[PDB]
Amino acid sequence: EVSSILEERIKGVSDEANLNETGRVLAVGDGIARVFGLNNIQAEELVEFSSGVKGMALNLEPGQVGIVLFGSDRLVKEGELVKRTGNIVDVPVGPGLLGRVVDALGNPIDGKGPIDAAGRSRAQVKAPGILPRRSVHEPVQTGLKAVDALVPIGRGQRELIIGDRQTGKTAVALDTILNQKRWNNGSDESKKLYCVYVAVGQKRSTVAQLVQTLEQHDAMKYSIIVAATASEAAPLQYLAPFTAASIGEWFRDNGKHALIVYDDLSKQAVAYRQLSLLLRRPPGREAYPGDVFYLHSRLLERAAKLSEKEGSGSLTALPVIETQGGDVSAYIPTNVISITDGQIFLEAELFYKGIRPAINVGLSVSRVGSAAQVKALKQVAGSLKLFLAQYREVAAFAQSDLDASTKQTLVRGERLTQLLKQNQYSPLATEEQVPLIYAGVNGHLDGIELSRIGEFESSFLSYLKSNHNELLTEIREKGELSKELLASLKSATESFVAT
Template sequence: MVIDPRTKYGGEPENSPLDRLEGYLRSYQFRMRFTEQGQLVSVGDGIAWISGLPSARMNGLLVFADGSRAMVFDLAIDRVGVVLLDDSQALTSGMPAFLTHERLSMVCGDSLKGRVVDPLGRPLDGLGELREVRWRAIEQKSPPIIQRDFVRKPLYTGVKAIDTLIPVGKGQRQLLIGDEGLGRSSLAVDCVINQRGLDVQCVYVLIGQKRSSIISTINTLRRNGAMDYTTIVVAEASALPGMQYLAPFSGCTIAEGWMHAGCDTLIIYDDLSTHAKIYRELSLLLRRHPGREAYPGDIFSIHARLLERSTALAVESGGGTMTALPIVETEQGDIAGFIPTNLISITDGQIYLDGNLFSAGYRPAIDIARSVSRIGGQAQHQQIKAEAGRMKLDYLQFLELEVFTRFGTRLEASMEKAIRRGRILREIFKQEQLNPLPVELQMAWLIAYNSGLFDNIELSEVVKVMHHLQQCLQKDPTSLEESRERWLEKLSNWFDEIVSTGVP
């Protein structure tokens, strides 16, 4: 007996090929069968047109006679537009095409930890086939309101400016926005590295990037021990447009599987500007009506449908969370572009990287005044929230006062003190790449700064003092639950040591 592979092609298979065969034989019935057979009309640029499939539906999966797959992307009166999922050189005009009546699915499960896969779940790292996986449909509805919970738990990024002033909560969607080359991806990588030991499963989606950049990201995560809890979904620049379009949805499906199993997950989309351009390319090739900047009219709903799947589930629904950090590119610092404004309106806040700060040598180049976290403060630890609130006000006042120093005007003593404290704070915010810091250190320097312990420290010594504080905390760990008085007592002793003996 010859079994037609189309009956289960690309669907949700059982545990093994033998199980699929046994299941097929058990359910087999001898009867007349009717099937639709389409015909390939034209193919090129990653898309194809097919005639003769009246039952085709959007996002439906079909298979050609040579075994290659495609996804229905456009429905016309007399033909169907599809995006190719397999790069086959055998596709020619007139080749038969068949509907599978299956949903495109993605592998899920713990066996994906430490693996690099493509948007269809095929391994790219040479470590062998995936074992003990589950299959989950890529197209999923976002959880309804009744299944969601408030954002209550903090997700620490290890970046001082973010964890104190722009906090991120588990289940939040926080946008990383800025021009190319300002360190958006570096921030995302630092955030993934900081999850080591915090029981957060990470998914990093790389869309349309060069192979050298992809390898660099993978090696960085591997060197820092982050691949043990991270899955990387790759659709490189040379991949078919359909694969690049599917990449964020496939990554979201992996993270969603862990979320519904009760785990905390973090997903990075690097980046959605490229994804929008890929979707525009496919839509124009399929002759859809262009809108603003030639993007199709539904580009907003595409990203909204993706990001709305990130949330915090209620305990009754599993209690898992999915935190999303989408990355978007601006041009010349213009956040009023079409795609950036769309994503700003969908997400719960944005972290804006400024080119002028980057050029001035401030790393990370986060513009505090134009960055915001709308719901992250609800998840922030209460002591950190109280200390950061006082400090943020001082910093924003400093940014306004610093403008006057450019004119060489003579300032009052109080203004000079405020400017000096602001410059010290800006030095504190400097942070080396691939050096995420523990939250206890954030608490330490916040209390030290608000208590005036940094006031007598020279600007050139601030970084060394921060390193010394970190070493002191490693020798004498202090919990966030300790009282402020206990924290201040320890910090005063440490700073007295610095003043008396100098910075180590």
Template structure:
């Protein structure tokens, strides 16, 4: 054969191979393993030698799993979808990406699951971007002090336990003492502000979540709220990642320079979900069978809530914890108290006495305090707290003695009126000017001559008339300006005239 013709044939072969490769789509290299066992929300997978922790895996049926354990011969995976269609022997594929969720304006007014998928029966939405569920908390140098109040509309909290934008305030108490009610009222009070609210339900019954959504809709607070539901019926893996996903949704707005409020309801169930996963994955148990890093999973979650220096945005966290028998020294409550900037403790004893909200002021504290409180509150809040604390002690003491001096009787009667003023129904949020008026009235003894049965009508009358009576001073209070001494006296005189006129 002619050498030239041989070279020509070889050239033709190479040319045909090159054209064939160019005409085909690029090859996709996928690393795959096999499921060895599956059950109770977890799976073990063999193979995948290059997989990394927190990587997302995809199974044959399209469901997802999160890599958690990296052992020598197999990996432990947290299932993020139902396991009915996953069997031992099925293939598992690497995605080479971490778990992310959709964020942005499209989620407002929607109910989504822990993966950001809509579960409210409405049309699917198109999110602007996706962010990782696990993100680093902002460095200390990127944070600024908490100095702007987040008004909850609850008089006891705003006056005595003020919460600032960027703060982390724990709500804890026994079952059925009104913890969720405080959180929902706090969201409702943001309806006329620029604050974006996120309600994260962990381990709740679906009926409870539906009730929360209904309450928000009735009070016109749902359009600026995202509800993320990881109910008790979903895989435990979704319950575990739910608070991190909700935090990522809030961080998007915080990084845009906006203010967000996030409710974790509640982290007791989150801790139990993590304990269940850890035991199934055969991680060493510690105190109360919780794994050793139980503190870390909540610390890294709550440290992401802060007030940013560069953008000026903030994210305020109100985590909820359920106690047993008022034991705030238990393992999980102690952990959360040490992480957060204060706590609001709800007492079942007060709840049974129909003192609502059932906040035990003596066991509650806000470590930010007056730094995030409007100046007008300081006229009355310090004196109010002292008077109420003395009243609680004297009331307990008076049960053992029938003979009390005039000063003690006066303090007890004043305390009863303070308690009546602080009593507040759910959904009945009180704005700043009305709160200031009620505080000034009770601390200056304007209700001392009224019967206890007249306190509530007097408070309603005052709330209905105070803004029109104060005029420009109401604007001054809302804008955070300090009232001069003569203005304080004028407010007291206006309130006295209102009470004298009506009662």
């Protein structure tokens, strides 16, 4: 069994051949070994030490080639062969990576045997050009009611998830992954989004929790989690989103759909800072590496929506940025805000105030907007945007002798706000998003008192399932709400509200 596998493995290593180029470490300090030798070395090429640590050679300096160690300092020690691997940083990519937790290099860290992969592709390749890209046109329903109505997310357009520190930012993201199960399970291959979650700089315990949570909701089977944990060396952390993008490319190029959620680019930044400053490359604004705008921009633009010429693939992306004390003027947030094409701004106050997901309706924007949103959901929730806008403006007036008009707004507004809460770590199908929102929009639930709004929500769903799962099925499949369907819906809501 295991004995046979080991016997296969010993047999599976063979004698080597003469290995071109060698170095001897000139000095190794600070995890920045600087090696004298390596006469022909391609820039950014992976070089392997005597000890067994791997490194890449970010600085090719005029007389020494400055390797950055991908492991603990102790491994390399002054003067020691530095072999030239001879392939610029590349990671296995393929359909086969589906369901394995792999580290930045690509080695299986899930321990579910060798990663079967169909190609190894370089980890720095340039983004799709002007003529390859065709404008966004396919909704991606995240399943959170607030995201799906208030801020639509479409295939192939990066949108930030910028919010306050440890306000369960990751939760908002994780919810998106869960909802993709609904489309994923089936047989329509122009519907499956194969998500890849890139956990950069998160403690190994946190990523273990992530792994378990995904397994619990039976979601590992369209997930690949590239994890470069907090422990892992600063080069590995640096290459972690770049590597991840390459994993995504197989999906994009082969013409599937996929969503890669880089969590959190704030920590990606910190890693780049560590590398650059230690390599003595010139410092820059807020002591962040000089070309830091350029680094983030390279990563985030690999996301795209390919034209029909180029196989109609996509690669939606959702970077998560941690705003330190909510200061959105900070250099690393500001750069990212510019680069991205949308924002979801989770606000700590809202989180505390029990609105979870805590999307601040005002300060979130979708720049690709109406291209996304299921056609049905668009129809019955144009109103929803406008109503909430009024509720925000008239919010402060909730401190007396108030006009009837003002009071009408307040009743409708409070009920809507209460309605848009979603219980954590459970997604909600699109076919039930359109009915629930319909009720609030048509003002049926205005009468219902705030405490009973929650009870009403679940009841409405069960009521819809019993009374007219014909109506629900029509809503789901037709995907567009015809006047006749809206008619039936009005009746159904009337019946439901009456009971």
